[PDB]
Amino acid sequence: IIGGEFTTIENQPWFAAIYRRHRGGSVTYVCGGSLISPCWVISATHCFIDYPKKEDYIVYLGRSRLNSNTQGEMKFEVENLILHKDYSADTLAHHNDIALLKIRSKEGRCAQPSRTIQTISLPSMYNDPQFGTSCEITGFGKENSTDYLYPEQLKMTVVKLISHRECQQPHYYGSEVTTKMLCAADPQWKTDSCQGDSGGPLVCSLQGRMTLTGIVSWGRGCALKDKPGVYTRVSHFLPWIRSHTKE
Numbered sequence: 001i002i003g004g005e006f007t008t009i010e011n012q013p014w015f016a017a018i019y020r021r022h023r024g025g026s027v028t029y030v031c032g033g034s035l036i037s038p039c040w041v042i043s044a045t046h047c048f049i050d051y052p053k054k055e056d057y058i059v060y061l062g063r064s065r066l067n068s069n070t071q072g073e074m075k076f077e078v079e080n081l082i083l084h085k086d087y088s089a090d091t092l093a094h095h096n097d098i099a100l101l102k103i104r105s106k107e108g109r110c111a112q113p114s115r116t117i118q119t120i121s122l123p124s125m126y127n128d129p130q131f132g133t134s135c136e137i138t139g140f141g142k143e144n145s146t147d148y149l150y151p152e153q154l155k156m157t158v159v160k161l162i163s164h165r166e167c168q169q170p171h172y173y174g175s176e177v178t179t180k181m182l183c184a185a186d187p188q189w190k191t192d193s194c195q196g197d198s199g200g201p202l203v204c205s206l207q208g209r210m211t212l213t214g215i216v217s218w219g220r221g222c223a224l225k226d227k228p229g230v231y232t233r234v235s236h237f238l239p240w241i242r243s244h245t246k247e
């Protein structure tokens with residue numbers, strides 16, 4: 001997250017920290033995610049596409065720090081890694097950048113709700129917030145483009161939704177952004193999501209209720225003028241989410 005503020009997992013109880021195991025013992029951060037149900041975490045497909053091996057992943061819930069333990073945190077293995085079949089990446093755009101991870105503790109249990117672990121509500125069929133509405137993003141991503149390391153503390157910021165019309169302008173992203181995507185940015189282009197924030201949530205207060213409106217997917221640079229962050233439009237993927245979360 002470029003700009004914004006450092007926060008705690010208590011303020012983002014649905015945030016999942018996804019890591020990958022390596023040959024030896026090293027565990028590096030891969031992407032963010034959101035707990036949509038006790039057994040399911042939703043993230044982005046581009047995070048795992050190059051290494052579809054479920055065994056190499058670890059999902060942490062209730063974690064506020066990148067490389068240190070948090071009180072109340074819970075560790076999970078990946079029981080099932082579901083990538084979207086129609087995923088593809090063009091020059092800039094990442095299409096159908098959405099994924100599901102069925103989690104399970106070593107004891108075979110799913111998540112247990114607490115003050116630091118809670119689910120986030122999914123949107124209704126084609127029911128998105130009006131453009132211009134403020135929404136929040138969370139992640140352990142880069143604080144600056146030039147950084148090669150991620151912040152140790154979880155960060156968050158607020159961005160505003162941009163109309164498909166405005167985002168489809170020539171100096172923005174043109175025809176590269178589709179209706180299955182959402183653009184959001186800071187009106188002053190000071191704060192934004194960045195590398196490392198992928199898979200994390202774009203949460204909007206819809207009718208007095210926190211909703212998982214989008215998933216951090218792509219963008220040209222970070223906090224670059226006229227280059228909004230692009231998010232996977234969750235409301236357009238409800239049929240897919242349901243079909244892959246049953247049995």
Ligand SMILES: C[C@H](NC(=O)[C@@H](CO)NS(=O)(=O)Cc1ccccc1)C(=O)NCc1ccc(C(=N)N)cc1
Nearest residue numbers: 092192193194195198217218219220221222223229
């Ligand atoms: C997977 C994805 N790839 C891209 O976005 C590619 C185009 O597909 N563009 S980029 O400009 O190379 C992303 C980037 C930004 C800054 C430095 C290096 C990479 C990626 O890096 N995803 C993370 C990401 C998410 C949001 C934003 C943003 N809000 N500006 C920027 C980056």
